[PDB]
Write a protein that binds this ligand. Structure first.
Ligand SMILES: Nc1nc2c(c(=O)[nH]1)N[C@H]1C(S)=C(S)[C@@H](COP(=O)(O)OP(=O)(O)OC[C@H]3O[C@@H](n4cnc5c(=O)[nH]c(N)nc54)[C@H](O)[C@@H]3O)O[C@H]1N2
Ligand SMILES: Nc1nc2c(c(=O)[nH]1)N[C@H]1C(S)=C(S)[C@@H](COP(=O)(O)OP(=O)(O)OC[C@H]3O[C@@H](n4cnc5c(=O)[nH]c(N)nc54)[C@H](O)[C@@H]3O)O[C@H]1N2
Ligand SMILES: Cc1cc2nc3c(=O)[nH]c(=O)nc-3n(C[C@H](O)[C@H](O)[C@H](O)COP(=O)(O)O)c2cc1C
Ligand code: SF4
Ligand code: SF4
Ligand code: SF4
Ligand code: SF4
Ligand code: FES
Ligand code: FES
Ligand SMILES: [W+6]
Lengths: 560, 913
């Protein structure tokens, strides 16, 4: 009794809360995630791997499971949510939202596959096969440009896909990766493999002889930047230990597919060069960051790594979740630490402050692939190759309007005419050479009149271009040059990490300005200068190259 | 210093200084959006509006982010840099809503755009997210967001409330709460830090916008004052429009550094509530007094009639004087306020001791930290904290026991979280309940309620036996350690693990971690002190600090948190029965004669009664008249049935309050006083910081200043007082308070805050004390061993549940102020109690359902909230709800020494309702 009550106006809102503020962890969800995790650690740097485990187990990441994961790892809700939503392959489903269909089909819509009708193919598959159990979505370049158009069914990538073959895969439940035959651990050792690494560990081959061969060899970074490898290995060594190593296998530049070829044919050649560099800089752990779109490579590496002897360096294999920006070395570091892939500011530089704020060595897959050959055959053998005054060997990923697309292992410094005619079989019939992209999406667009420029590190900077990862895309007369520029801008608009204004907003405004029929080339000129000068990282600094070069070198397309 | 060249001039830069800071110090202002030059905000360098040109670099550099180096050459006026900054601003302007009708047309963004002559964009607009007005205090309109991340930094690194994140990618990057949930239904605690940080108006106080999310209300003036609620002592800037406070912002005070909590930022509204008393009231000479009496504050004419100030003052003083001159001087008592100023407390205790002629003066400190104070005086001969809460940043190990600082001292808790996040401090929480802070704790010990002594004695046993103590400190600065070494034998972790519920390995690990650290700091609160054995718990904590030497150095010491905004200052002014001002004992002849010469009147030499003793004496008919100012014992006293009986038994009760509170129901005369925001005076915070308050607005109607009312009562009690105002009172107090040496009203006005004790009028005060010994007779602290004592009332088959009482974030004590503040009322509208979900399942209840709570002393009915932080076998309930008053059930049994009731433990039964 004794109602007493209270004259305070809260009686209008007088419904209170049945639970504390915010969403609440479900006891049933906690048990399910705890068994799913098992004996795995709960450190922050395993967050993305744990997100993969939930998405693969259930086909989606429900808010119930996500909330349970945060409680397990002692993280806040916004911490796990902001991380998961960064990556394109994670589907977060909140309460009352539609579930993700069991099977997902992804149609590449990047530059090379679009030239072979990917836009119509995606429309057909959405009209034909999309249902309550099949979902059809666009995807950026999946490193299959020489087999365009490329479509992924589950984990199974289809070469030269069409309506009939894609429907065959769905009916046959052919949704898994097809592992090919490759050079395995025993065949590698029968060919003298790992002998060079053994000499290094014992001490018969001095570390100083490895660096001398690299510096005299002139090996340069094949990830695109071209920094000399021997000079980079020395710098990481100079810093106080402990030291770490990470391999960049996030091959995401549209038109680049060379790294996939070497992983799927001779994995142990890559693994030896990685282990040699790890010994030179005395790195205990090596992290391998492999892109999500390479399921065949992921399976091949997992088996071969398990075949290695009990060495002094532990190998960690990590898996991406779909982000082009994660190839940038500092953004790759943030992803390995379990966070959003946002590039860091410099200074300091990654070789001084990197993974877990330790001196870290980052190398591309192809750069480490050639380390064994450069030592066992000498620096003189490497420098014997080259044309037009340039020195070295290069692997050009060539696609487009050529008869024989693929990876060409050709001398550095060739011209596009020489590359097309001496290694690609020439322009395909019913087409005439019109334009080419020397460095993939970010390298600019050039007319066929400029077919006499050697393609090498540092030679394209005169014309506002760069070789990058040597992704060469060939265009013909039946290829809108301004349409190609809009495709690249749409790629950069989607792939921007969103950190800084010139890139996050500049790519959006540039895309909207290019979809009008008459480009305001003066306003686009001023915008391009701002993005080059003020963007934080390489993506924003190069996103305006396709617009800038098309305006400059194709004057006949823009009426006054 | 790092000397370099800036814009063609030779300059020198201090270490750890950015190019933007150098240019600003030298007068050259560079535009900035994502950089906020205020403490705690690390530059991020993402908006790119501050770009400068550095010679020998390919691209431009962010001046707010880069520090200069020897030989560098920086240029900011070049066409490249100016063009880039202008283009960044133009890109941002493209997406902004139209300025004249925007959410803040005078935002920092628009001022920066004005400086750069950018008013329109050549770039097309994009349609962004919609408005979110789910939270009653703040409004979210992300169509004006520029993605600067200042709110993310505010929530995650400054406050570390961990609510906001930046979720998606590219131009779709979006500020989100939790899983992109509405703000009103998220984990947001409404501290408002993000609102203060945001430069665009995307986040605003809801009171500034109309129904269309435009046209920020524009205050006429801003006044700098303090927060009226808790002992942290935040400095606040009140925004006033049409003589009404509409909003409040944080100020760079030494305690808070621009940070606030929800009560400080949004809880100012109670001063304008329609229930504010405006005229004196006199009880009608027809209505009897009853314990179950009820008066409607909106309509008090059922029991009262309004009176002139002269008539009401005459009635109050005449009743008191008649009781004094007929029944004797010991038949009177007074309850002062810990929420008033130091000057008002001094005048109140002077009034009691001279007009009433007795030492029966006390306040809520008797219910707060009496046992802790008793233990500390027995040990160190002092009751003060030995370090401020900001010393947590220098502490390797931080211990929080029996305190819930993220609810009851939130700004100090933000500094603790800063220590954990940025300095690697290891936090150990000892509390039967898990808390929001527990996720950051290195260890959370969740021992059984009432068993502090067992766990602390096990830790002391581990330290003593394994030889982890500081022998050098013990031999030289303490005494009586041999007694402890002898006593502690029977308190091994193996025996005590079952008693405390914490495994022996955890106890050993925590003891080693505390003893071996370079610096350890202990905080404790009501969970330790509010038991019949609270003095034992405090003795254990003091022994832990003494034997390991973790006291008297930076990052070390003992900090029992001060609850009310001015409990420390009221205690210093002598508003307690056993001492004169500055803790001078009323029993010593020398002190009594000094004060008899100072005040010119003989004084009673016997010690007074405490709050609970006073209530007992009222219930027995020994005390006849009472004067109460700024206290609500009809809700805050234990065992409210008998307490209200005692209050209704009085011959004459005078109440000086802001509203017709539950205590004022039984009053004979009610005198309307002025709130904190209407007065001037000095207030002392938990860190011994004396700070000055300023009047923001005027009192409503005919309400008067508290000091003026006390002066009127004294004058009618045959005392010749003539004080101009608080400053004169301060001078008189400083004449007899040596702790105020070198602190004056002028210095306080000029600086705003001074820490005592201080040795010069130009030097800062001593934050750390006891570095050279203790103010004992021999200069050494005495170790007093403790023994296990059971709670007064323990559960049985009749009453099987353990009942504990405490506080919630949005409400204050009895609810007299916070339930009259609109935002706080909206956040917590109904009376609720907390219980573990498994207990709800076992008892047959559902979340949000009603239940009947019963002890041997009373019964209530209220709603139930399911909470996984509450242990099995416990029910937790705040005492701020008049419809279900928690103190109707509590045990009035007292600690034998501290004389504090056992609010934190009693036996209850729960049934569905
Ligand atoms: N929002 C808000 N803030 C306030 C106040 C308010 O009313 N509202 N009041 C102010 C005042 S005057 C004061 S004194 C302070 C009080 O501040 P706190 O000391 O934080 O107050 P409580 O929440 O009562 O603290 C009790 C804590 O001890 C735990 N506990 C319960 N039983 C035991 C036990 O046997 N042993 C131990 N070791 N712990 C136990 C409880 O579960 C809870 O975590 O807060 C001040 N700040
Ligand atoms: N069950 C249980 N009981 C408890 C506690 C507990 O934890 N559990 N805690 C105990 C503790 S630690 C404390 S401090 C006490 C607090 O007990 P109280 O101090 O009685 O609580 P308040 O609600 O603050 O008291 C009435 C308030 O009205 C306002 N007010 C009244 N008159 C005036 C006036 O003239 N001027 C101004 N400016 N304001 C005025 C002030 O806010 C004043 O403090 O409660 C104690 N009781
Ligand atoms: C936007 C962006 C994307 C990149 N993507 C890749 C990539 O997919 N693979 C790669 O090896 N390097 C990539 N890089 C280069 C790396 O940041 C880094 O320079 C490289 O891995 C170093 O390779 P190296 O050690 O062989 O020189 C990218 C750089 C940028 C700015
Ligand atoms: S340039 Fe683009 S990708 Fe690089 S940090 Fe800025 S927004 Fe992110
Ligand atoms: S008001 Fe405070 S708790 Fe709420 S989102 Fe803003 S910073 Fe975080
Ligand atoms: S809400 Fe305000 S502070 Fe937060 S990112 Fe947007 S503009 Fe910046
Ligand atoms: S922490 Fe305490 S002093 Fe600061 S604003 Fe909140 S209630 Fe007021
Ligand atoms: S695979 Fe479609 S463009 Fe590379
Ligand atoms: S203010 Fe320096 S980059 Fe935003
Ligand atoms: W208190």
């Amino acid at each position: 009794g004794t109602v007493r009550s209270f004259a305070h106006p809260g009686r209008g809102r007088n419904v209170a809360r049945a639970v504390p503020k915010g969403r609440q962890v479900d006891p049933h969800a906690k048990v399910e995630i705890e068994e799913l995790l098992g004996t795995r650690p709960r450190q922050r740097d395993l967050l993305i791997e744990h997100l993969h485990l939930i998405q693969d187990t259930y086909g989606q990441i429900s808010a119930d499971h996500l909330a349970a994961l945060a409680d397990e790892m002692s993280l806040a809700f916004a911490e796990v949510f902001e991380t998961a939503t960064f990556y394109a392959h994670f589907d977060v489903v909140k309460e009352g939202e539609a579930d993700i269909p069991r099977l997902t089909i992804r149609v590449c819509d990047s530059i090379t596959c679009a030239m072979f009708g990917a836009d119509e193919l995606l429309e057909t598959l959405q009209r034909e096969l999309a249902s309550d159990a099949v979902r059809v979505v666009r995807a950026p370049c999946v490193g299959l440009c020489d087999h365009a158009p490329a479509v992924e069914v589950g984990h199974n990538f289809l070469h030269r896909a069409d309506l009939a073959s894609v429907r065959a895969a769905v009916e046959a439940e052919d949704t898994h990766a097809h592992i090919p035959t490759y050079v395995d651990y025993d065949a590698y050792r029968a060919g003298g493999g790992y002998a060079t690494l053994e000499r290094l560990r014992s001490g018969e081959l001095p570390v100083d002889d490895v660096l001398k061969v690299l510096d005299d060899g002139g090996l340069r970074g094949l990830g695109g930047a071209g920094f000399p490898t021997g000079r980079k290995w020395r710098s990481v060594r100079g810093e106080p230990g402990p030291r770490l190593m990470a391999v960049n296998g996030d091959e995401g530049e549209p038109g680049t597919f060379k790294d996939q070829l070497y992983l799927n044919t001779d994995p142990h050649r890559f693994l030896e060069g990685m282990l040699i560099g790890a010994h030179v800089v005395e790195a205990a752990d090596v992290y391998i960051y492999l892109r999500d779109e390479y399921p065949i490579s992921r399976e091949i590496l997992a088996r071969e790594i398990a075949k290695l002897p009990e060495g002094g360096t532990r190998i960690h294999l990590r898996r991406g979740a779909g982000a082009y920006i994660c190839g940038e070395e500092s953004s790759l570091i943030e992803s390995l630490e379990g966070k959003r892939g946002l590039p860091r500011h410099k200074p300091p530089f990654p070789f001084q402050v990197g993974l877990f704020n330790r001196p870290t060595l980052i190398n591309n897959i192809e750069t480490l692939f050639w380390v064994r050959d450069l030592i066992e055959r000498g620096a003189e053998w490497w420098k014997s190759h080259g044309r037009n005054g340039r020195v070295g060997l290069r692997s050009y990923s060539v696609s487009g309007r050529v008869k024989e697309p693929g990876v060409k292992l050709a001398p550095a410094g060739l011209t596009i005419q020489e590359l097309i005619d001496e290694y690609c079989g020439g322009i395909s019939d019913g087409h005439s050479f019109a334009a080419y992209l020397p460095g993939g999406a970010s390298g600019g667009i050039l007319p066929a009149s400029m077919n006499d420029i050697p393609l090498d590190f540092g030679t394209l900077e005169k014309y506002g271009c760069f070789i990058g990862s040597a992704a060469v895309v060939i265009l013909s007369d039946q290829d809108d040059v301004r349409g190609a520029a809009l495709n690249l801008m749409k790629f950069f608009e989607d792939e921007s990490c969103g950190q800084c204004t010139p890139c996050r907003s500049g790519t959006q405004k540039a895309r909207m300005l290019m979809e009008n029929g008459v480009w305001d080339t003066d306003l686009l000129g001023e915008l391009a200068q701002c993005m080059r000068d003020a963007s934080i990282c390489g993506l924003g600094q190069a996103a305006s190259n396709p617009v800038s070069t098309v305006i400059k070198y194709f004057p006949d397309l823009f009426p006054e | 210093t790092i000397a370099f060249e800036f814009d063609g001039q030779q300059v020198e830069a201090q270490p750890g200084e950015t190019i933007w800071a150098v240019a600003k110090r030298l007068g050259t202002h560079i535009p900035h959006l994502c950089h906020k030059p205020d403490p705690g905000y690390r530059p991020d360098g993402n908006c790119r509006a501050c770009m400068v040109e550095i010679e020998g670099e390919r691209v431009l550099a962010a001046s707010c982010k880069r520090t200069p180096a020897i030989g560098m050459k920086v240029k900011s006026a070049t066409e490249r840099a100016t063009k880039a900054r202008a283009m960044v601003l133009e890109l941002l302007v493209a997406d902004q809503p139209e300025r004249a009708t925007s959410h803040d047309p005078s935002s920092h963004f628009w001022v920066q755009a004005d400086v750069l002559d950018v008013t329109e964009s050549r770039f097309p607009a994009a349609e962004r997210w919609t408005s979110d007005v789910s939270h009653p205090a703040m409004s979210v309109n992300l169509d004006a967001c520029i993605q600067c991340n200042l709110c993310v930094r505010a929530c995650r690194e400054v406050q570390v409330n961990d609510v906001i994140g930046m979720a998606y990618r590219a131009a779709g990057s979006k500020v989100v709460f939790d899983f992109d949930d509405p703000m009103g239904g998220s984990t947001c605690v409404a501290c408002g830090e993000c609102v203060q940080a945001c430069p665009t108006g995307a986040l605003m106080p809801a009171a500034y916008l109309d129904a269309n999310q435009t046209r920020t209300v524009y205050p006429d003036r801003e006044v700098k004052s303090l927060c009226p609620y808790c002992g942290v002592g935040c400095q606040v800037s009140y925004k006033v429009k049409d003589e009404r406070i509409v909003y409040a912002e944080g100020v760079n005070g030494p305690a808070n550094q621009n940070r606030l909590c929800v009560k400080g930022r949004f809880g100012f509204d109670y001063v304008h509530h329609p229930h504010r008393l405006t005229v004196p009231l006199i009880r009608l000479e027809n209505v009897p007094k009853d314990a179950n009496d009820q008066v409607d504050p909106a309509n008090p004419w059922t029991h009262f009639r309004e009176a002139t100030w002269e008539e009401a003052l005459d009635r109050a003083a005449g009743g008191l004087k008649a009781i004094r001159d007929t029944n004797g001087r010991k038949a009177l008592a007074g309850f002062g306020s810990a929420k008033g100023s130091n000057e008002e407390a001094y005048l109140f205790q002077k009034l009691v001791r001279l007009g009433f002629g007795t030492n029966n003066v006390d306040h809520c400190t008797r219910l707060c930290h009496a046992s802790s104070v008793a233990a500390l005086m027995e040990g160190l001969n002092s009751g003060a904290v030995t370090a401020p809460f900001s010393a947590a940043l220098d502490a390797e190990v931080i211990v929080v026991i029996g305190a819930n600082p993220t609810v009851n001292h939130p700004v100090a808790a933000t500094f603790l979280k800063n220590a954990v996040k940025q300095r690697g401090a290891k936090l150990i929480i000892m509390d039967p309940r898990r808390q929001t802070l527990s996720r950051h704790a290195y260890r959370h010990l969740a021992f059984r309620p009432g068993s502090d002594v067992a766990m602390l004695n096990a830790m002391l046993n581990v330290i003593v036996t394994e030889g982890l103590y500081d022998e050098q400190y013990i031999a030289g600065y303490t005494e009586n350690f041999e007694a402890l070494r002898e006593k502690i034998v029977d308190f091994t972790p193996e025996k005590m693990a079952s008693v405390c519920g914490i495994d022996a390995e955890t106890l050993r690990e925590v003891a080693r971690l505390y003893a071996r650290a370079k610096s350890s700091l202990i905080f404790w609160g009501m969970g330790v002190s509010q038991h019949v054995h609270g003095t034992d718990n405090s003795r254990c904590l003091i022994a832990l600090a003494l034997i390991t030497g973790q006291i008297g150095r930076p990052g070390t010491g003992l900090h029992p948190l001060r609850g009310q905004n001015n409990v420390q200052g009221a205690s210093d002014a002598g508003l307690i029965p056993m001492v004169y001002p500055d803790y001078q004992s009323v029993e010593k002849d020398a002190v009594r004669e000094l004060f008899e010469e100072f005040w010119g009147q003989s004084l009673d030499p016997q010690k007074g009664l405490t709050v609970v003793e006073i209530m007992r004496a009222i219930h027995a008919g020994e005390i006849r008249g009472m004067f109460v100012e700024g206290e609500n014992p009809a809700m805050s006293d234990p065992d409210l049935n008998h307490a209200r009986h005692a209050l209704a038994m009085l011959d004459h009760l005078v109440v000086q309050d802001l509203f017709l509170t539950e205590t004022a129901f039984h009053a004979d005369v009610v005198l309307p006083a002025s709130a904190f925001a209407e007065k001037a005076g000095t207030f002392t915070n938990t860190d011994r910081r004396v700070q000055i308050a300023q009047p923001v607005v005027a009192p409503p109607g005919d309400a008067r200043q508290d000091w003026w009312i006390i002066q009127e009562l004294a004058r009618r009690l045959d005392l010749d007082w003539n004080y101009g105002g608080p400053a004169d009172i301060f001078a008189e107090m400083a004449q007899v308070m040596p702790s105020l040496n070198n602190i004056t009203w002028e210095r306080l006005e000029r600086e705003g805050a001074v820490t005592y004790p201080v040795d010069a009028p130009d030097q800062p005060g001593n934050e750390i004390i006891f570095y050279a010994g203790f103010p004992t007779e021999s200069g050494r602290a005495k170790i007093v061993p403790a023994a296990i004592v059971p709670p007064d009332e323990v559960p049985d088959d009749e009453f099987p549940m353990v009942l504990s009482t405490g506080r919630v974030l949005e409400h204050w004590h009895t609810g007299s102020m916070t339930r009259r503040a609109g935002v706080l009322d909206a956040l917590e509208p109904e009376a609720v109690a907390f219980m573990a979900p498994k207990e709800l399942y076992r008892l047959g209840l559902r979340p949000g359902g009603s239940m009947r709570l019963e002890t041997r002393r009373g019964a209530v009915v209220l709603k139930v909230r399911s909470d996984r932080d509450v242990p099995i076998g416990m029910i937790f309930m705040p005492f701020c709800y008049a419809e279900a008053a928690a103190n109707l059930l509590t045990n009035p049994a007292l600690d034998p020494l501290g004389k504090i009731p056992e609010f934190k433990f009693c036996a209850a039964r729960v049934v569905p309702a």
